[PDB]
Design a protein around this ligand. Structure first.
Ligand SMILES: CC(=O)N1Cc2cc(S(C)(=O)=O)ccc2[C@@H]1C(=O)Nc1ccc(C(O)(C(F)(F)F)C(F)(F)F)cc1
Ligand code: NA
Lengths: 12, 252
């Protein structure tokens, strides 16, 4: 259950 | 939400060309000149033998890490592309899950030398024999053949920028919720790419671009070989594969 994409997308 | 979700003028298309090329330059991972200069640094027979003596699982882990590093630059390229951040999160993830690996496969031609059929890997250039421990020789051969085909087009960096932006912004990806918004963004990126080709007398490359089915087949083979490796070494994938790689290729 790895969800790195939303973290990379949300990090500004 | 974004100018490029509606009809764009010629001036706005010229602005889109500049913006895509800038986003690509800032996220290209390695400068082209840096890859070309290293072409003379070739793995010796002894070094090739060393890679071939590595276990299948250690070679799979190393290659998954290198692909994940390349994918992170593609995620940043996408975040900098006009309109992408204005799409809903569901669609950003659909486009990145389907297209990040396709963009990596296209960018890979920059690191491939058609003169001797070698690719940049861990500081030097090596032939497909360098990857024999993976036990996926069809997939490696297909990637080398693909890289060889794109290398014959003599892409400029701006052409790679415009082409990879279109590879990512594809309104046909299943799962898109705002399909019309993606179609208009794709139409404008397609005009930007074709405008640049027209201006630079390079429109003859369009008929020579690979069919979309080709990038799809390569991505499908990569997922199929990963499934085979995962059945052999499930704990290697669970414990030592990068989380982002598992999110894109094994559903978690
Ligand atoms: C550090 C390193 O080694 N880099 C930096 C860098 C940057 C670019 S760039 C976007 O800046 O041009 C292009 C290539 C490479 C090269 C690399 O990552 N090479 C590589 C990786 C995986 C595979 C394969 O997984 C397989 F299986 F052959 F190992 C595969 F399948 F993708 F080909 C091949 C080559
Ligand atoms: Na090349």
């Amino acid at each position: 259950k790895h969800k790195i994409l939303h973290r990379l997308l949300q990090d500004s | 939400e974004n100018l490029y979700f509606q009809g764009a003028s010629l001036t706005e298309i010229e602005h889109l060309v500049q913006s895509v090329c800038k986003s690509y330059r800032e996220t290209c991972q390695l400068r082209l000149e840096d890859l070309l200069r290293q072409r003379s640094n070739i793995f010796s027979r002894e070094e090739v033998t060393g890679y071939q003596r590595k276990s299948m699982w250690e070679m799979w882990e190393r290659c998954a890490h290198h692909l994940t590093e390349a994918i992170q630059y593609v995620v940043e390229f996408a975040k900098r592309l006009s309109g992408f951040m204005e799409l809903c999160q569901n669609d950003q993830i659909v486009l990145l899950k389907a297209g990040a690996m396709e963009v990596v496969l296209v960018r890979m031609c920059r690191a491939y030398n058609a003169d001797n059929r070698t690719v940049f890997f861990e500081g030097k250039y090596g032939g497909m024999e360098l990857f024999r421990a993976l036990g996926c020789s069809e997939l490696i051969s297909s990637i080398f053949d693909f890289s060889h085909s794109l290398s014959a087009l003599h892409f400029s960096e701006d052409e790679i920028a415009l082409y990879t932006a279109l590879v990512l912004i594809n309104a046909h990806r299943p799962g898109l919720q705002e399909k019309r918004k993606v179609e208009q963004l794709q139409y404008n990126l397609e005009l930007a790419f074709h405008h640049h080709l027209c201006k630079t007398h390079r429109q003859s490359i369009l008929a020579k671009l690979p069919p979309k089915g080709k990038l799809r087949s390569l991505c499908s083979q990569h997922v199929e070989r990963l499934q085979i490796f995962q059945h052999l070494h499930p704990i290697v994938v669970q414990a030592a594969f990068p989380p982002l790689y598992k999110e894109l290729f094994s559903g978690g």
